[PDB]
Amino acid sequence: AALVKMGQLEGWQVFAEPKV
Amino acid sequence: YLTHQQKVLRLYKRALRHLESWCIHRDKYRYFACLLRARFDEHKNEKDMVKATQLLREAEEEFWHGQHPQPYIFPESPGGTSYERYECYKVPEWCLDDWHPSEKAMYPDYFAKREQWKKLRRESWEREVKQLQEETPVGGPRTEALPPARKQGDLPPLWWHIVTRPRERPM
Amino acid sequence: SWDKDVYPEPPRRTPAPSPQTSLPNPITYLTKAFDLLVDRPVTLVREFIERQHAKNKYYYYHREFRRVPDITECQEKDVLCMFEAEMQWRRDYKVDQEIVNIIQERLKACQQREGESHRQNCAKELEQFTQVVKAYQDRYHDLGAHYSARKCLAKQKQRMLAERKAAKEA
Amino acid sequence: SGYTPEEKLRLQQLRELRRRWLKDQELSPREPVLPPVIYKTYRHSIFAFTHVLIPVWIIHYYLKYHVTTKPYTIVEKKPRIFPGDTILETGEVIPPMKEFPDQ
Amino acid sequence: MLKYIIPTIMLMPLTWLSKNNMIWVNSTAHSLLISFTSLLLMNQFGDNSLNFSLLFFSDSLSTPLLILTMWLLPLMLMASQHHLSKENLTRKKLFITMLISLQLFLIMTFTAMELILFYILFEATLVPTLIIITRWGNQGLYFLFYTLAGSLPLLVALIYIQNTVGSLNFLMLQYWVQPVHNSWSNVFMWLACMMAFMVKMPLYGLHLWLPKAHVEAPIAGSMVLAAVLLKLGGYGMLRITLILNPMTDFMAYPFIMLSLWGMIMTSSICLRQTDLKSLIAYSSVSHMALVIVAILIQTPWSYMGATALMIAHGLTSSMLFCLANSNYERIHSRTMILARGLQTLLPLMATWWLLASLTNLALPPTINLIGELFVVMSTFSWSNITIILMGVNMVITALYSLYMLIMTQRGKYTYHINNISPSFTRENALMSLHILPLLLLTLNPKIILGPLY
Amino acid sequence: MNMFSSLSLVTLLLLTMPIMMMSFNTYKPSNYPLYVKTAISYAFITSMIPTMMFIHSGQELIISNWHWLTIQTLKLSLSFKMDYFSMMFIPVALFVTWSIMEFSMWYMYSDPNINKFFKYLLLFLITMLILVTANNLFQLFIGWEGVGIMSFLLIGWWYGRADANTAALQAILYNRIGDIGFILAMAWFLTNLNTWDLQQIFMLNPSDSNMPLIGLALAATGKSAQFGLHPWLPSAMEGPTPVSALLHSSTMVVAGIFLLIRFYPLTENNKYIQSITLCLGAITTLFTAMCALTQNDIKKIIAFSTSSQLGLMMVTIGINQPYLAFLHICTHAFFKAMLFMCSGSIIHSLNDEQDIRKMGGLFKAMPFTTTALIVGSLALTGMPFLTGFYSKDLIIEAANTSYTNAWALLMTLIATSFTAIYSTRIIFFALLGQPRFPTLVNINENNPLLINSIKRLLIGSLFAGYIISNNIPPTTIPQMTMPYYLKTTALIVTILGFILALEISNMTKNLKYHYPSNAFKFSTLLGYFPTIMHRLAPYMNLSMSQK
Amino acid sequence: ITKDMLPGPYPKTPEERAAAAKKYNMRVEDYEPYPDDGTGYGDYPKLPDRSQQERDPWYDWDHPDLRLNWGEPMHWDLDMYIRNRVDTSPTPVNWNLMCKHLFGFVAFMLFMFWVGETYPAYQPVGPKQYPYNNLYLERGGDPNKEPEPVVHYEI
Amino acid sequence: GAHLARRYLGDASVEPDPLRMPTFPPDYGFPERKEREMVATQQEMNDAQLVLQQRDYCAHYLIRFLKCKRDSFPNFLACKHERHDWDYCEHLDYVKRMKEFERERRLLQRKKRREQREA
Ligand SMILES: CCCCCCCCCCCCO[C@@H]1O[C@H](CO)[C@@H](O[C@H]2O[C@H](CO)[C@@H](O)[C@H](O)[C@H]2O)[C@H](O)[C@H]1O
Ligand SMILES: *C(=O)CCCCCCCCCCCCC
């Protein structure tokens, strides 16, 4: 929960879209 | 653990010693020591053993009130100022087995006699062990008293560490 | 033997003896024994050694580091220029440490030398020590173990901005 | 409250061995078998030379030519100057104090 | 560094190609020669480090650790060759090879210029270490926890830093370091960059693997573990803190509290330890808690003290394990109270016990005291109140150091122990090779003060 | 200057030579103790030459010969302060040690480790001279902790005896608690000033010196066994008698006072610190003098006598008379060392009996030990014109006429009366009366080593105070005007103490039973502080450590 | 040694008590485990909380300095109760009276020192007088700033 | 002394305060007061390296004694008269401070008497 809230605020990608 | 007699005699000695610490001077101690003996002689022939125990109990409570906070202690007694002073100087005899032969050669006569004792120890061990087996009831000893040697030529069982213990002033 | 300007000593003034007694002074007879027994043989041995050093004379030099551009002139992330500025700043940092050490030794020598009158007679040395310690503190204090020319420059700019802001306030 | 005959006998037997053991700790005449005012002045003279004179030569050499050759290594408290004194370095004479009130 | 890597590698062919009975003579003689040449690394400059190539470098921090590492290998060989006497030849040679490969990884670890190269070698040191302790030891959760909470997060953080900064070369990071701004993601980067080193120090609260490890390890394993392996954590933190500012200002607080309190706790525990090897292991936790504090407050004085403490502890703690091992090889027990009054039976070995104890309690002017003093001065500026905790720790340390000396060396000897043979020349030489260099470093302390000097 | 400095250092170097030659270099095990005694004898002579030069012209030196380490802006050099305090103390310490070493040659004759004993005594002396000549705090700390370690090794000399080891560890414990204050002072001076050198500390002369001086006072409390950290000094009697003589006179115990004397330029201006040191000294001198009134071990009485005198020195610090405190150090060394050697003479002749209740009747049986004991006792009690009168009497006058804490002044005067009582106690029970010792009489003091060592200290306890006080330059303005009842207070309270003590000691011969009052038990058991504290604190710490 | 002869978990049924008591060379009546709380004593016996100093010094102990016999169960806190550490011997004065007397003495002294500070002794004299403006320059005063003079007169 | 019983048990208003005094002008009741003369100069006391607490109105006698003590070495008994002159001068100095205390005491008593008289 604390991590999930942190990721929402910081925009941490779970399944990050390929970029490079 | 101690009989009633042994407790009365141990209090008598302890009371006298603490009295000595108070009086200091020998004439004064002699006077009060005789009064203390007269107190022990007052109830010497007490038959009622309930009365006698009560007398001993009160005696020990009176002793606790009257004891010296700093009684005299013989220098080498436990708690004395020389107690265990020389323990650092007591080296066990088995250390001699590890001497370099050049160290042993400075004392030929001593180390020759030392072999004889080691031989005497080895040849006696089996008979000492056998003696203790045939005198020990089934279940092991009930006390720590050891027996003497009962034949001629036998040595009392478990003698080595008593006979060859370090001297009290080893240097 | 050393630069008397860098490590100054005031002129010495020993008073001439004025003995008002008739007993001989044992310290004068021990001085002559010392000169005869200790000093002279020691001097002879040294004179022999110095003769050998004279036969073989060779020299060493004090390394001179040319000046290179400061960290203020280095472009961001330009390691080649930053490396030379950083190394120079470290050399200057080490030299400033020894400058403070020189001024501290002046102060300490003055205290012992002036004796009971040191509180009044060492005012100049105390004042100079006070100023140099301030300047050293401004340059280098509070930088941390990972100090650098960059962090020193950032500290300077913070101080300069505060001074500029205080000048306007006045 | 005495020894039982058993206790008496064991102590006697241990006593005999202990005394024989103690006697055997005595050294024989040959053991240990080792491998192969003038005097009062000599020791004091040799001791003075090796422990005072030689160290003072080393120390005096050390201080004179290595320690005092560096700045502020040996710092003297400057000599006291009293009125009336004469300074060797310059020859200056220090004027006497004023005249005291009678006391 | 190739002048040290290659000869160290050649110790392996030497050991395997040596005559059957010369394996200890050849490996010890030639590892001492390598240790001798390691003094060439003391070509250190006031401004620049000694940068050999694109892979390896040596500053004033890694040099003393390198010299300590290369000195320890010959000492470990002497300490081991008695209890490995009955092992067969091939297992003797395999044990020596493990020690050589551990030195090979260590010297490269302390000189790796790139942090990811450091990380790989930093983890390779565990392979020979665990083999040594298990295969020649006396008789899971921490491996799993350490990798989960230490090793793996460190790998991700280093890889992340390289993507962002573009490099992990330590020289490059000195010029491209950017400040770490407050953010939840940076809090995890900070912890990911430090937890692997804190576990290895160990940090108080993460320390219970160390007494367990020392109890199981053979003498050589305890020597390298106590002298060098713990200092990988200290060395790693001294390097990686370069790129963690200014976030270290507040992130250090919980770890400073753990160390300052942990100092007193582990020192106190030493008073009640019944096993010598556990007592020394807890003593190391106490000493290393001072190094953690010194690294975290990062002042010039604390870094000089931290470097001296790491070197001084390495010699002292290693010497204490060797002293305890010399008793174990006679009485075959680690219990401290079992064999007492040993000064009566082994007079010279009691002198080693005294000297080792005196350095352990940091008697001036030993480098144990110099390092400890510098940290005490630096933490006093950090907060004057810390002097109370530091002072109390000095008291308790002297208590357990002298308690260990008094319990084993003084009092009456134990009657029934009659196999206390005189000290061998091998053991006396081993002790003097710890304490002589340690006491000689008092004459020239500047070479173990690190790059902040 | 060249002869002054060379001879100052050769005094120290000469003392390390017997240690250096222990590494097989013409080392004569034959008579190593005699070799070490001769070195002390020659070191004393060479140290007299710099002292004479200082007495003459007041010459003073700082020798910073060797540069050891530079930590940025902090240079550490091996530096020696050959000043007033060093020039007077070193000759006194060497003179006393010379006698203690010659005494030890007879006292420790049978000890199989006689050579190791003299090595330790010599190391004890070297580490103490490092302490007193130190010019920087780090160098002082080397000597400070060096004497502490040598006390541990010498207190626990008979290491097979459990009480010896306990007493030795106790000394380390209490001294290390004081060393918290020592490192506190070092940390403050480095941070606030930028130095550990005494010269720069006195030149900057900080005004907010409460914290550094509290730290220094705490260090003095442990090392000089002031109240709170005092129990270790009486327990140090576990060591052989020569150790106590050196520990209690010219080493260890006075290092705490010496540290505060060296920092008088700072304490001169801190009235808060003067108050604290005054009160601490007053309770120490009174409390330990009370404990000595009921002790029966002759070495414990003299140990509590030292603590009481150390308290008086601490009082002198607190009234801002650092030079009188130093003079008491020097005078006290002469007769306190002699008293321990007289006690060892008695103890040796009665086969290691130390309880005065088993002595008596020795006045005629040991005439030379008796003479030294009476001379030593009279010096201690401030008998006019003996060595002790030239410091103690001035200290009482200075305290009487000072702007001072009144209760502290009172406690100090009472302790002066108590000094007479426990001095009377030793003389009465040891020398007078009838023999109370065993029947096989082995009393013999006709050994030249015994007579000569005591004799040199007996001469010291007669004229040293007069000789020293007439050579030292004045550094204060002594208070010489006061009412007759303040001028003679020390003499009166000392005489009343003798009168009171003789009455009580003569009551012991009456044929009347004797019951213990709460006050008697309080004195006998040292105010209960060791009993409560040495069981409670070890229990609390040890019990929490396991869990 | 075997697992049966090593310490075990807290004993539940009385039969485990008998086996534990024989393991520790004690009779079943004397054997008593520690409370079955969470500490982790197991079935290790709880023995009297007495220092080794209280044991008879004249008996021929197998360990004279520890006053222990071979095979006899060791107190859990034996290393705290050795003769070098915590003593629990009877004292001639009751423990509570010792504490009150000691604390009463320290409290009284600290109080009197406070009183002595508030009413200090001193002699009937005025302040000591110094020349040259109370030695303004000697005390380090600024020579460029003129000091406000202090004047002393005869009496 | 008795003077402490007065201040602490009796009336402190009429007893001098050692820290505060003098609390009256130095010329009150004193028509034309001569200043104390200092014989030794600042340079002389500086050059002699007198301790600061010794640099009082008797310093010139101390300077004289210290010079004699230096010129008579090794005779450490040769300057008794000079030592006494310094000792006596300090005695006169102390008496002056005793008079200052007494003068302040009588003035405080005088102030008390007037206040009653004005009341
Ligand atoms: C320089 C002068 C020094 C003087 C020091 C004086 C202060 C120190 C002594 C304080 C004693 C206080 O004692 C306090 O009261 C009494 C005894 O007094 C004690 O308690 C008990 O003492 C005695 C003996 O059992 C009983 O008669 C009393 O009835 C009872 O109360 C308390 O345990 C203690 O709290
Ligand atoms: C008068 O000349 C002053 C000097 C006299 C000393 C006074 C004696 C001590 C007083 C005790 C009272 C306690 C109150 C704190």
Tab-separated table of N, CA and C in Angstrom, chain G residues 45-102:
chain	number	residue	atom	x	y	z
G	45	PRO	N	18.143	-26.045	34.812
G	45	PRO	CA	17.659	-25.832	36.177
G	45	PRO	C	17.815	-24.390	36.622
G	46	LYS	N	16.877	-23.949	37.447
G	46	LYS	CA	17.015	-22.700	38.176
G	46	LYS	C	17.628	-23.012	39.534
G	47	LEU	N	18.829	-22.515	39.768
G	47	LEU	CA	19.569	-22.752	40.989
G	47	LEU	C	19.612	-21.486	41.833
G	48	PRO	N	19.981	-21.590	43.109
G	48	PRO	CA	19.945	-20.410	43.981
G	48	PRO	C	20.813	-19.281	43.447
G	49	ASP	N	20.309	-18.055	43.581
G	49	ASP	CA	21.012	-16.870	43.093
G	49	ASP	C	22.024	-16.444	44.149
G	50	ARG	N	23.148	-17.149	44.165
G	50	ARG	CA	24.196	-16.931	45.146
G	50	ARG	C	25.536	-16.860	44.436
G	51	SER	N	26.397	-15.965	44.901
G	51	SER	CA	27.726	-15.866	44.331
G	51	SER	C	28.570	-17.059	44.758
G	52	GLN	N	29.591	-17.356	43.958
G	52	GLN	CA	30.514	-18.424	44.315
G	52	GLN	C	31.293	-18.097	45.577
G	53	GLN	N	31.336	-16.827	45.972
G	53	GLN	CA	32.054	-16.442	47.177
G	53	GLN	C	31.404	-17.005	48.431
G	54	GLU	N	30.106	-17.287	48.389
G	54	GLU	CA	29.392	-17.812	49.541
G	54	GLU	C	29.684	-19.278	49.811
G	55	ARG	N	30.311	-19.982	48.879
G	55	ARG	CA	30.591	-21.391	49.069
G	55	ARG	C	31.769	-21.576	50.011
G	56	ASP	N	31.819	-22.744	50.629
G	56	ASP	CA	32.820	-23.012	51.644
G	56	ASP	C	34.211	-22.999	51.022
G	57	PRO	N	35.121	-22.131	51.471
G	57	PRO	CA	36.448	-22.074	50.848
G	57	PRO	C	37.385	-23.192	51.263
G	58	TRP	N	37.077	-23.926	52.326
G	58	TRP	CA	37.971	-24.960	52.822
G	58	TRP	C	37.733	-26.323	52.187
G	59	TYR	N	36.626	-26.513	51.482
G	59	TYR	CA	36.356	-27.795	50.856
G	59	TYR	C	37.272	-27.999	49.654
G	60	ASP	N	37.545	-29.263	49.340
G	60	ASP	CA	38.436	-29.603	48.231
G	60	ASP	C	37.629	-29.613	46.936
G	61	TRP	N	37.378	-28.416	46.420
G	61	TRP	CA	36.666	-28.273	45.162
G	61	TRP	C	37.521	-28.766	44.005
G	62	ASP	N	36.868	-29.364	43.011
G	62	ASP	CA	37.581	-29.696	41.784
G	62	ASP	C	38.082	-28.442	41.085
G	63	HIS	N	37.410	-27.308	41.293
G	63	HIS	CA	37.829	-26.009	40.766
G	63	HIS	C	37.919	-25.030	41.928
G	64	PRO	N	39.077	-24.937	42.583
G	64	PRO	CA	39.163	-24.089	43.784
G	64	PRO	C	38.870	-22.621	43.536
G	65	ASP	N	39.295	-22.073	42.398
G	65	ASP	CA	39.067	-20.657	42.138
G	65	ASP	C	37.628	-20.379	41.732
G	66	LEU	N	36.947	-21.365	41.165
G	66	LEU	CA	35.533	-21.250	40.852
G	66	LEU	C	34.645	-21.822	41.943
G	67	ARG	N	35.212	-22.579	42.878
G	67	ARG	CA	34.450	-23.279	43.907
G	67	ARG	C	33.315	-24.084	43.287
G	68	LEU	N	33.677	-24.880	42.291
G	68	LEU	CA	32.761	-25.780	41.617
G	68	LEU	C	33.348	-27.178	41.629
G	69	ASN	N	32.470	-28.167	41.635
G	69	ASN	CA	32.865	-29.556	41.506
G	69	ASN	C	32.543	-30.050	40.106
G	70	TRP	N	33.372	-30.962	39.617
G	70	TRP	CA	33.148	-31.558	38.308
G	70	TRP	C	31.811	-32.285	38.284
G	71	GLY	N	31.036	-32.048	37.230
G	71	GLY	CA	29.750	-32.683	37.060
G	71	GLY	C	28.602	-32.006	37.767
G	72	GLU	N	28.877	-31.081	38.675
G	72	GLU	CA	27.821	-30.375	39.381
G	72	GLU	C	27.179	-29.348	38.451
G	73	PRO	N	25.854	-29.200	38.478
G	73	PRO	CA	25.212	-28.244	37.574
G	73	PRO	C	25.652	-26.818	37.863
G	74	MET	N	25.930	-26.078	36.798
G	74	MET	CA	26.377	-24.699	36.905
G	74	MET	C	25.182	-23.762	36.880
G	75	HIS	N	25.229	-22.733	37.717
G	75	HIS	CA	24.182	-21.725	37.691
G	75	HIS	C	24.174	-21.027	36.342
G	76	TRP	N	22.976	-20.700	35.859
G	76	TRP	CA	22.858	-20.056	34.556
G	76	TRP	C	23.762	-18.832	34.457
G	77	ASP	N	23.808	-18.020	35.507
G	77	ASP	CA	24.619	-16.806	35.544
G	77	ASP	C	25.935	-17.017	36.274
G	78	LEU	N	26.584	-18.159	36.057
G	78	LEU	CA	27.814	-18.464	36.777
G	78	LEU	C	28.902	-17.442	36.473
G	79	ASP	N	29.001	-17.004	35.221
G	79	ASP	CA	30.047	-16.058	34.861
G	79	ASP	C	29.826	-14.691	35.489
G	80	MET	N	28.601	-14.385	35.911
G	80	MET	CA	28.340	-13.174	36.675
G	80	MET	C	28.630	-13.352	38.156
G	81	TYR	N	28.618	-14.585	38.652
G	81	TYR	CA	28.744	-14.869	40.072
G	81	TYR	C	30.128	-15.361	40.461
G	82	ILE	N	31.078	-15.383	39.525
G	82	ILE	CA	32.443	-15.734	39.884
G	82	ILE	C	32.939	-14.789	40.975
G	83	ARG	N	33.996	-15.215	41.662
G	83	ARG	CA	34.497	-14.451	42.796
G	83	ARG	C	35.037	-13.086	42.396
G	84	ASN	N	35.339	-12.869	41.116
G	84	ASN	CA	35.820	-11.571	40.662
G	84	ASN	C	34.702	-10.575	40.405
G	85	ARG	N	33.444	-11.002	40.440
G	85	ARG	CA	32.351	-10.129	40.039
G	85	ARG	C	31.338	-9.959	41.162
G	86	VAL	N	30.075	-10.288	40.910
G	86	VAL	CA	29.016	-9.916	41.837
G	86	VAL	C	29.082	-10.793	43.076
G	87	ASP	N	29.180	-10.154	44.234
G	87	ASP	CA	29.110	-10.823	45.521
G	87	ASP	C	27.724	-10.626	46.115
G	88	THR	N	27.190	-11.687	46.715
G	88	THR	CA	25.899	-11.645	47.387
G	88	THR	C	26.015	-12.074	48.843
G	89	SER	N	27.214	-12.013	49.406
G	89	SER	CA	27.439	-12.517	50.746
G	89	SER	C	26.657	-11.702	51.773
G	90	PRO	N	26.280	-12.312	52.894
G	90	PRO	CA	25.634	-11.543	53.958
G	90	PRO	C	26.531	-10.413	54.431
G	91	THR	N	25.919	-9.278	54.716
G	91	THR	CA	26.632	-8.127	55.229
G	91	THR	C	26.283	-7.900	56.698
G	92	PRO	N	27.220	-7.402	57.505
G	92	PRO	CA	26.893	-7.139	58.914
G	92	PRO	C	25.799	-6.102	59.098
G	93	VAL	N	25.664	-5.159	58.175
G	93	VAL	CA	24.610	-4.153	58.212
G	93	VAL	C	23.570	-4.517	57.166
G	94	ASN	N	22.298	-4.394	57.530
G	94	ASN	CA	21.227	-4.700	56.595
G	94	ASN	C	21.347	-3.828	55.352
G	95	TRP	N	20.960	-4.396	54.210
G	95	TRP	CA	21.139	-3.701	52.941
G	95	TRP	C	20.367	-2.390	52.909
G	96	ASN	N	19.130	-2.392	53.405
G	96	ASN	CA	18.313	-1.187	53.330
G	96	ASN	C	18.853	-0.089	54.234
G	97	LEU	N	19.373	-0.449	55.408
G	97	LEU	CA	19.967	0.559	56.278
G	97	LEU	C	21.240	1.128	55.671
G	98	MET	N	22.039	0.287	55.016
G	98	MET	CA	23.230	0.786	54.343
G	98	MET	C	22.863	1.861	53.332
G	99	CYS	N	21.834	1.605	52.523
G	99	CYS	CA	21.457	2.556	51.486
G	99	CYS	C	20.974	3.868	52.088
G	100	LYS	N	20.128	3.800	53.117
G	100	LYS	CA	19.612	5.026	53.717
G	100	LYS	C	20.728	5.836	54.357
G	101	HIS	N	21.643	5.171	55.060
G	101	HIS	CA	22.746	5.888	55.689
G	101	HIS	C	23.651	6.532	54.652
G	102	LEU	N	23.955	5.810	53.576
G	102	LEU	CA	24.828	6.354	52.546
G	102	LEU	C	24.161	7.515	51.823
